[PDB]
Amino acid sequence: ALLTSKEMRFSAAEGAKVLLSVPDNLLSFSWYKGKDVNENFTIAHYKKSSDSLQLGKKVSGREEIYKDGSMMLRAITLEDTGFYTLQTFKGQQEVTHVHLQVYKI
Amino acid sequence: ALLTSKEMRFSAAEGAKVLLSVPDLLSFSWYKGKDVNENFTIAHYKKSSDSLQLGKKVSGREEIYKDGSMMLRAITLEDTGFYTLQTFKGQQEVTHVHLQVYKI
Numbered sequence: 001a002l003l004t005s006k007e008m009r010f011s012a013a014e015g016a017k018v019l020l021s022v023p024d025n026l027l028s029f030s031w032y033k034g035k036d037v038n039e040n041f042t043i044a045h046y047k048k049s050s051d052s053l054q055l056g057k058k059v060s061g062r063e064e065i066y067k068d069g070s071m072m073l074r075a076i077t078l079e080d081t082g083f084y085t086l087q088t089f090k091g092q093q094e095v096t097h098v099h100l101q102v103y104k105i
Numbered sequence: 106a107l108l109t110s111k112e113m114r115f116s117a118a119e120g121a122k123v124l125l126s127v128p129d130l131l132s133f134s135w136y137k138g139k140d141v142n143e144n145f146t147i148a149h150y151k152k153s154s155d156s157l158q159l160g161k162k163v164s165g166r167e168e169i170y171k172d173g174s175m176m177l178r179a180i181t182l183e184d185t186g187f188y189t190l191q192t193f194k195g196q197q198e199v200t201h202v203h204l205q206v207y208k209i
Contacts, residue, residue, distance in 0.1 A: 044159065050170065053148075053157055057165030061146070066156040 002092040009099045012076045020084060021070045022096040027089040029069045033058040035083040035097050043071075043084075078102050107196035115202065118209035119182050125190075126174035127200050132193040133173045137162035139187040139201050147175070147188075182206045 012018035031043040042056025044065045053065065060080075064072035069086055081102045088094035117123035135147040146160025148169050157169065164184075168176040173190055190200040 042165075044157070052168055052170045054168045055148070055159065055163050055165055059159045059163040059165060061159055061161030061163065064156050064158045066154070072156075 004092065004094045006094070006096040007099070008096065009101070012073070012080070012100060012102050014076055014078060014102055014104050016076050018073045018076060018100065019070060020073065020086075020098045020100065021068075022086055022098065024069060024088055024094060024096075025090065026069070027091075029086060029088045030056075031065070031071055032056070032085045032087070033082070035085055037085055037087045037095060073100070076102050078104070108199070109196065110199040111201070113200060113202045114205070116205045116207065117177070117180055118207045119180055121180060121209075122176065122178045123180065123204065124174055124176045125188060125202050125204065126172065127190055127192075127198075127202070129172050130192065130194060134160075134191045135167075135169070135175055136160075136189040136191070137186075139189055141189060141191055141199070177204070180206050182208065 010018055010020055026048060028047045030045040032038060032041045034041055041058050043058050044056055045054040062074045069088060081100055084098045086096040115123055115125055130152045132151040134149040136145045137147055138145050145162050147162050147167060148160055149158040166177055166179050173192060185206045188202045188204060192198045
């Protein structure tokens, strides 16, 4: 059925914090490292039904996940630059492609 | 203020699913091991903002529920050891949950 999609671009400074927030009724969501929704690259998978969160393997330990799908990042490094994908369920699927570019200053 | 504490013991078979649950909030934290050191965090849930802070001892096989329970899946026998739950309420409870894995 439906499938909405988006692209964004956030900026962040080394050693600083960023909020990857996306303006989107919701059933579950998942964050992946990169532009692709692949299950081997998950950070976290929230399930509104179970009010739980399943951890992925691309967790760095500098991430905070909120229940509106927002994700906070801390202690940013030049390695933190790249893509991160948010998949929202409702049946619908939303796919937000969040880009992060880190700069030195 | 208060400081209650407990120790528990769960068993599970290699490659299966287990639930580490504790009888219960403002926040809680799961650590890999018996030591409450933040370099050892698995996850820190904060009931006030209803968010979740991921730690550096995340292996990627954990699920966190809002009663402080942590489910483990795809267990690999390397996960035998301690796992600690620190609950914030006002009091603090500290549970040292041991987990034992079998090959079955």
